[PDB]
């Protein structure tokens, strides 16, 4: 894994020692080359994981996420170029360094073979994200959003640290391979119940769960474009990755303990999709849609069936791409009109035609038009839940309908109608923004042709 | 590279980690026993040195 | 004008050198974990003539 | 200078002599104080510090050439003369910056006196700066809260330093000062109102002269008497101010004072007290812009001696 | 506590002569390299604090930082290895001396053992 | 440029020499110690 | 309440100074080369070369191997009359029931 | 333990309660500190004399020496407090809070 | 510690009156300690005011303890399930409601019900499962 | 204070601590504590203010009561055992009294009331000495007598310390009081593992000393004693405030910074002894310290507060005095996590 890690680390000295003109160019070029290197990890032996070393391993679950992060870094730099132009060279380099540290931490989290190291790196991501949000946000609420994000995540995580240390003491090892191979069943005792809660709750917080999702809207709304992109695409997926990894330890109690979170996620998906219908801010609407899709992912993980896990992996990747693209599309309008109110900018299809097509494709993926990977994941999850209970179809179908409604309502309001007369600052879309949208869309559409890559280990 | 490389490396990694887990549990047990009993090198708390005592004839016989 | 080009565009050598170094260190770690190179019960074979390791 | 030097036996008292004195020549605007101060410094063999201006710190730092107003001072005396009651707050910004400059100059003069033993002659000082502030407040140019901020800064800062031994006040009647201002012909100065000068004089005589006279003796000279610089120097030579702080001061207090004076930032620490008066409070964006501009100024990016742009060399081994 | 009262421990000795039996830390150890990296970061921070050129000024000072950190790290690593080796030595000796407390367990193959199957339905 | 001579000014050649010499001595001492310890380890453990 | 600089007008359109801005910077040369770097190293290299690399990635998932083994097993079991799939994953004899 | 040990330990307890329950003056609490020191001297002396710990008959004298050192420190602080406030009242040590 | 031994010794779900008395004693002791600390740190103006504050705090604590013990024991009896933590949860929520009544605030009552009931259920679970708040050093 | 006298007094404080950490006789340990108090009182009042005198008086009274209680405990142990050696304490009442005295010296709640007041009254340098060096001797004495300590009392004091140090800091806008409350919380963390593993207490003490030295030296460099005064520092010396933000994050315990390792190892050691509720409550309560750390960071570096015009003069000049150890202190406080296994050296 050092083939990827070491170059990512060298990205920092290059960025710091690069000329003021050339920071973005060098960062983008070398990040893209690193992403190209990451594509080698997609080749996964079916039976066994790629155990590169004692510290690091990759499987059919970690590989797609690593590729996603490496891909995301250059898109994040491209998106963040515009609003950081006025910033001084040192601050721009610090922002790029925060992004690079975040990528390094995420890669090590995904490839780490020990749960304690995974915890250290997974919590470590808070610092760069917190710094980004609270230093390069454009609103007074960036500080409160940072406090909420940090404290929600830490309150979830710390009991996880206690539980992991206890597991290390009892089983004797926190290496995932040994844990999987031995994996003695849990007993239905209050102590084991609370251990299950401690293990699950941190990832339940990271993956916005209904009742623990309040941090996500504030953080995504108040964060800069790059921070929103990472939070939606990758940081949420850390919870899913950990929950899929951690579920091995808690085999039997999961059936008994799943019902509260299963019900919360299933009803919350409807609740948040309905929330999206009446939201007045584009970023907030995108965030709530993210919440709903991650609720679908949570249901898939809790059910603990192979098809559900494959759907969860596919949905994680597809949603990361789609939500990042949606945030970037909203950010372009925000830069042009300097407001996140949906009503303020209208009829943008006439003014900016190609951005309208980008919006259409992003919304279609959001509403799971087949054969999109979004639909593949959602359909697999839906079938697994149908096996879990035939009555599940009602809520899932209602959620599908509400998702289509809110996605196309966003598209109609922002990109359709008569243009807002007074707004005169709309200017022809730059090649950079269209290139960012295309870089988002094309990999998602291409991944449909070969869907085994994003279908996870159980495939 | 061929699958045999990964197969063998996984075997080696598993052996190393399992040995470490067994050693960790053994260390925990050993420390518990030593602390409870005090019969081992660890947890040997200090006691007064017998060299300090003076055995020379005292002022009074009955000492 | 090479002296000028390299003096202000040498930063482009860091990350590829990083990739090279990473490959080297990964091969070293593969060296470390050679215990059951050909001692498995599945891939254990008799070394073909002119071979010392199955690189496993 | 350092604590180690004092431990070794570097003592201020030995270097100081009868010549070692701080002489402050004060007066109203265009009172001729500069001429007498220069003559006194020349005759008594004392270093002369010209009156602190907006750009004195620029003179003492870096190249020594004045920097742009935005980077250093953000205040204009000409603006104060033309528009005394501007909503910009230029009046109190000017007054506070001038007090800061005079505090720095007093620190530098004390450092010179305590390092080399040579006396220093100053044109006005931190102790006399309140005269202009009171006139501004009386004339309505500045608000009461600005006066309170000035009082807080002076109270925190001025106490540390030792007052001057000899105060020389050159007194010129205000109408003659008006005629002098007309004769000099500076357009902005001509706008000075008579009441403002009268309040300057009132502050001086009612408050400064009595308070200074309490500590030591003050030599008050009329304009005709001031012209005879030799007689003034003789008067100074025959002063005996046994009362006052300097005879009380010993080597320990001199060590403390020299340590304070050497560290200019410590001297100016409380000039930046976090009192958010609109006049002197600078917003975050403007502050960032101005600080970036100051950093880009030649010779200011790095610590002195490490700026390659201005010709510093051997930085790698320096 | 623990190793503090180990018999034969000379007071205020960083490395006992017994440690020399253990292999010395390799000068290319990753831990020592990280200590040198810490020294380099210390030099950079010193330059930043004193407002000197961060990466070019004071090469002698940065060299001294790196050398001091590596020099102390070598001995710190040696002592750490010695302490862990002492722990392992004592643990194995105690296991040997108390066979009853650490009994060998009968090894049953998974065929013999019965583990209940919980269906994921 | 500066009217007041820079406090650092020219390099303090005594300070630079002492720093570089101390670094060199520490490195040489470390290398000799490593060689000695390797010899001792091989000797005691054969 | 404070002396602060006027809010900067909406950042000057990069089109005004350079009509073919391409975004990515104020300086046109860096704009062109940034666009070229992005397009080349993502579209031409990562998407096309990377997509080809994924498409022809060697089948280490053993799908074809599994299919061939299944074909062999089906042929043998049908020829010998043995059931196509045995109900017991592991041979019963080796298991020792309580 | 004989009853004299009871009485001396009771004296220490009483002095501790007195010191921990201030009223107005600081001198009284310094006197309670000195009383605690006297009680400690008496206890140590009784123990060392009953047990014939010959080389420990000096410990009370060192205890007294450091008790007087503490008393001197207390008085030197009380003088400054009185100078700064005009009284030894404890209520004037109120500038520092929490 | 004798009061804690008194509360523990009575079998759960039995002798509800004695259990309530033990809980009331524990609440009274805790209230007395809190009142002492309040009187010391925040001085009372008069001896009568100090007595009033002590009485108020002590009665609130005693009422909380009495309600908790009475409700928990009665629930254990009626449900007939002695070791269920839900009985302790019900007792704790009743204690929180009593605290809200004494403070004459609904919000205090509801927050106290939630937190105190959860804490009491956790305490019962610790009894059942042998959880150690303070663990003897065993390493 | 003449610098020679100051050097002598500081050496006397350090010598008292050394006597505490070097003596096998209870009398000499108590003598070391008394010498520490005698030397420290003038040091706290090096700058003469009424606040300095008030802080010195409060400190003297609290430490004198602690010393008298410690001497009574020593005498009781002598009465019931006849031994002067620092070892297991053979009388439980003496052990309780000694624990109370040593906690009062360390400022462990419910004996914390003096720490914030004293810290606020004294200067930043005297505060650094008070909150880093003074902690050493009582912790050393507690480590030597850890076996005799009743775990319940020490753990109760530690938990109360954590809670109170977290709560009080939330309400503080004065940097020195914030540091005092954070010190209370971290000391509560250190004493929690004293019954279980002393090496963990030593490791936490070292990390805490490094972080507190870095923080106090940074504040001295910025000459800030209030949050608003620290707010201006971004205009003059941004690097200082950025490093302060990093050090604050380490103090909060966030991974991957070095502040994480002490909490990590304390939790591990407590869990090994079956302590699960106590570590969970301690870790959760640490979030409040994180909260006020983050508020300070927001004020100092993450957000740019309004400055004043006179700062333009300060831009021209440069900091005269250099604290040599500050960069290494920052690096150790923030970037030492990858080197935790080295916690067997002090072992």
UniProtKB/Swiss-Prot annotation, chain A:
Location of this chain's protein in the cell: Mitochondrion inner membrane
Assigned GO CC terms: mitochondrial inner membrane; respiratory chain complex I
GO molecular function: NADH dehydrogenase (ubiquinone) activity; ubiquinone binding
Membrane topology summary: Multi-pass membrane protein
One BP annotation, GO: aerobic respiration
Assigned keywords, A-Z: Electron transport, Membrane, Mitochondrion, Mitochondrion inner membrane, NAD, Respiratory chain, Translocase, Transmembrane, Transmembrane helix, Transport, Ubiquinone
Known catalytic reactions: a ubiquinone + NADH + 5 H(+)(in) = a ubiquinol + NAD(+) + 4 H(+)(out)
E.C. no: 7.1.1.2
Transmembrane segments: 22-42, 60-80, 98-118, 147-167, 193-213, 224-244, 257-277, 284-303, 308-330, 351-371, 391-413, 435-455
Disulfide bond entries: none
Highest taxon of the lineage: Eukaryota
Record note on quaternary structure: Core subunit of respiratory chain NADH dehydrogenase (Complex I) which is composed of 45 different subunits.
Function of the protein: Core subunit of the mitochondrial membrane respiratory chain NADH dehydrogenase (Complex I) which catalyzes electron transfer from NADH through the respiratory chain, using ubiquinone as an electron acceptor. Essential for the catalytic activity and assembly of complex I.
Membership in a protein family: Belongs to the complex I subunit 4 family.
NCBIfam families reported for this sequence: NDH_I_M
PANTHER family assigned: NADH-UBIQUINONE OXIDOREDUCTASE CHAIN 4
Protein's name in the database: NADH-ubiquinone oxidoreductase chain 4
Lineage of producing organism: Eukaryota, Metazoa, Chordata, Craniata, Vertebrata
UniProtKB/Swiss-Prot annotation, chain H:
Residues that span the membrane, as ranges: 1-21, 29-49, 61-81
UniProt keyword list: Electron transport, Membrane, Mitochondrion, Mitochondrion inner membrane, NAD, Respiratory chain, Translocase, Transmembrane, Transmembrane helix, Transport, Ubiquinone
Membrane-related topology note: Multi-pass membrane protein
The keyword Cell wall biogenesis/degradation is assigned to this record: no
Catalytic class of the enzyme: translocase
Catalytic activity: a ubiquinone + NADH + 5 H(+)(in) = a ubiquinol + NAD(+) + 4 H(+)(out)
Compartments it resides in: Mitochondrion inner membrane
Disulfide bonds: none
Keyword Signal (UniProt): no
A GO CC term attached to the entry: mitochondrial inner membrane
Signal peptide as annotated in the record: none
InterPro entries: NADH_UbQ_OxRdtase_chain4L/K, NUOK/Mnh_C1-like
Highest taxon of source: Eukaryota
Gene Ontology MF: a single term: NADH dehydrogenase (ubiquinone) activity
Pfam families: Oxidored_q2
One record GO biological process: ATP synthesis coupled electron transport
EC number: 7.1.1.2
Protein's job: Core subunit of the mitochondrial membrane respiratory chain NADH dehydrogenase (Complex I) which catalyzes electron transfer from NADH through the respiratory chain, using ubiquinone as an electron acceptor. Part of the enzyme membrane arm which is embedded in the lipid bilayer and involved in proton translocation.
SUBUNIT field: Core subunit of respiratory chain NADH dehydrogenase (Complex I) which is composed of 45 different subunits.
Family classification: Belongs to the complex I subunit 4L family.
Alphabetized PANTHER family for the sequence: NADH-UBIQUINONE OXIDOREDUCTASE CHAIN 4L, NADH-UBIQUINONE OXIDOREDUCTASE SUBUNIT ND4L
Name by which UniProt lists this protein: NADH-ubiquinone oxidoreductase chain 4L
Swiss-Prot record, chain J:
Membrane topology: Multi-pass membrane protein
Function: Core subunit of the mitochondrial membrane respiratory chain NADH dehydrogenase (Complex I) which catalyzes electron transfer from NADH through the respiratory chain, using ubiquinone as an electron acceptor. Essential for the catalytic activity and assembly of complex I.
Entry EC number(s): 7.1.1.2
InterPro entries per record: Complex_I_Subunit_2, NADH_DH_su2_C, NADH_UbQ_OxRdtase_chain2, ND/Mrp_TM
GO molecular function annotation: NADH dehydrogenase (ubiquinone) activity
GO terms classed as biological process: mitochondrial electron transport, NADH to ubiquinone; mitochondrial respiratory chain complex I assembly; reactive oxygen species metabolic process
Chief site of localization: mitochondrion
Annotated catalysed reactions: a ubiquinone + NADH + 5 H(+)(in) = a ubiquinol + NAD(+) + 4 H(+)(out)
Quaternary structure and interacting proteins, as annotated: Core subunit of respiratory chain NADH dehydrogenase (Complex I) which is composed of 45 different subunits. Interacts with TMEM242.
Subcellular compartments: Mitochondrion inner membrane
Protein name in UniProt: NADH-ubiquinone oxidoreductase chain 2
First and last residue of the signal peptide: none
Gene name for this UniProt entry: MT-ND2
Pfam family, any one: Proton_antipo_M
Record keywords: Electron transport, Membrane, Mitochondrion, Mitochondrion inner membrane, NAD, Respiratory chain, Translocase, Transmembrane, Transmembrane helix, Transport, Ubiquinone
Highest taxon of the lineage: Eukaryota
Protein family: Belongs to the complex I subunit 2 family.
GO cellular component annotations of the record: mitochondrial inner membrane; respiratory chain complex I
Transmembrane segments: 3-23, 25-45, 59-79, 89-109, 149-169, 178-198, 200-220, 237-257, 274-294, 325-345
